[PDB]
């Protein structure tokens, strides 16, 4: 499924992500936007086997097993594919362990380059939250 700006905002909140590790909800909506485009199915291969899956584009060399990325430790202990379903529990759930290992949302190339230090609040303006 491909989420609505507003809509995904809400969803992620229901699920504990607002100020999770002190990261505003906007950080999260902005990140997923430029990262996956509100599309939970999206997938992406980088050059080293590794692939990126779902709304928050979590990698497979560390977070989820996908059966074809050898370097794999399955820290999220979920099969990559689970991350693509129209239900972001797994992702959000897994996303929480990436945000807390140590590099905040810096672990996400995108938020950093295009979200980090912009007024992320405008992402959730107009939202009934």
Swiss-Prot record:
InterPro entries: Glyco_hydro_22, Glyco_hydro_22_CS, Glyco_hydro_22_lys, Lysozyme-like_dom_sf. It is found in: Secreted. It catalyses: Hydrolysis of (1->4)-beta-linkages between N-acetylmuramic acid and N-acetyl-D-glucosamine residues in a peptidoglycan and between N-acetyl-D-glucosamine residues in chitodextrins. Its EC number is 3.2.1.17. In the egg white and polymorphonuclear leukocytes. Disulfide bonds join 6-127, 30-115, 64-80, 76-94. Gene3D superfamilies: 1.10.530.10. The active site is at residues 35, 52. It holds the Pfam family Lys. Keywords: Allergen, Antimicrobial, Bacteriolytic enzyme, Disulfide bond, Glycosidase, Hydrolase, Secreted, Signal. The keyword rRNA processing does not apply. SMART domains: LYZ1 (SM00263). Its main location: secreted. One of its GO terms (molecular function) is beta-N-acetylglucosaminidase activity. The keyword Hydrolase applies. Residues 1-129 form the C-type lysozyme domain. GO terms for cellular component: cytoplasm; endoplasmic reticulum; extracellular space. Substrate binds at residue 101. One of its GO terms (biological process) is defense response to Gram-positive bacterium. It comes from the Eukaryota. Monomer. Lysozymes have primarily a bacteriolytic function; those in tissues and body fluids are associated with the monocyte-macrophage system and enhance the activity of immunoagents. Has bacteriolytic activity against M.luteus. Belongs to the glycosyl hydrolase 22 family. Lysozyme C is capable of both hydrolysis and transglycosylation; it also shows a slight esterase activity. It acts rapidly on both peptide-substituted and unsubstituted peptidoglycan, and slowly on chitin oligosaccharides. This is Lysozyme C. The gene is LYZ.
């Amino acid at each position: 499924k491909v989420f609505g700006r507003c809509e995904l905002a809400a969803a992620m909140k229901r699920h504990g992500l607002d100020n999770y590790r002190g990261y505003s909800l906007g950080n999260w909506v902005c990140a997923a936007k430029f990262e996956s485009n509100f599309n939970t199915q999206a997938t992406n291969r980088n050059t080293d086997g590794s692939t990126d899956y779902g709304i928050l584009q979590i990698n497979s060399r560390w977070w989820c097993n996908d059966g074809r990325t050898p370097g794999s430790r399955n820290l999220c202990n979920i099969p990559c594919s689970a991350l693509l379903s129209s239900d972001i529990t797994a992702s959000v759930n897994c996303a929480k362990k990436i945000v807390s290992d140590g590099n905040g949302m810096n672990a996400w190339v995108a938020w950093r380059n295009r979200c980090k230090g912009t007024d992320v609040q405008a992402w959730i303006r107009g939202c009934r939250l």
